């Protein structure tokens, strides 16, 4: 499934993406694919990792009743809309669930 929900665009805008939250308490993450490596790279996770480029500008939120993991990029320095990936588990690369360009 590739429901890229948000290609939204502003120099100071904030984009919120809803993410499938399986709830079996597994690590849930927002990931970013890199063309050079060919492998997706974590930007946000349940484990408190914040990527070097996105220090403090991205936030995660949990709704178990709604089963939603929202990722909020509050300052889009309009850096490349990447093909982002929701996934679960301790394997970021193969654990992806949905894509979100």
């Amino acid at each position: 499934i590739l429901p890229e929900v948000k290609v939204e665009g502003e120099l100071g805008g904030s984009v919120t993406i809803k993410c499938p939250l399986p709830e079996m308490h597994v690590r849930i993450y927002l990931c970013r694919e890199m063309a050079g490596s060919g492998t997706c790279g974590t930007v946000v996770s349940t484990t408190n990792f914040i990527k070097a480029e996105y220090k403090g500008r991205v936030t995660l939120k949990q709704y178990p009743r709604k089963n939603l993991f929202l990722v909020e990029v509050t300052q889009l320095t309009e850096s490349d809309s990447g093909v982002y990936a929701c996934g679960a588990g301790m394997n970021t690369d193969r654990g992806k669930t949905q894509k979100v360009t």
Binding site: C31, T39, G41, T42, S45, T47, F49, M90, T92, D93
Partner: peptide, 9 residues
């Protein structure tokens, strides 16, 4: 290899 698999640190 597992730590690299997490792709966090």
């Amino acid at each position: 290899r597992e730590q690299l698999n997490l792709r966090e640190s």
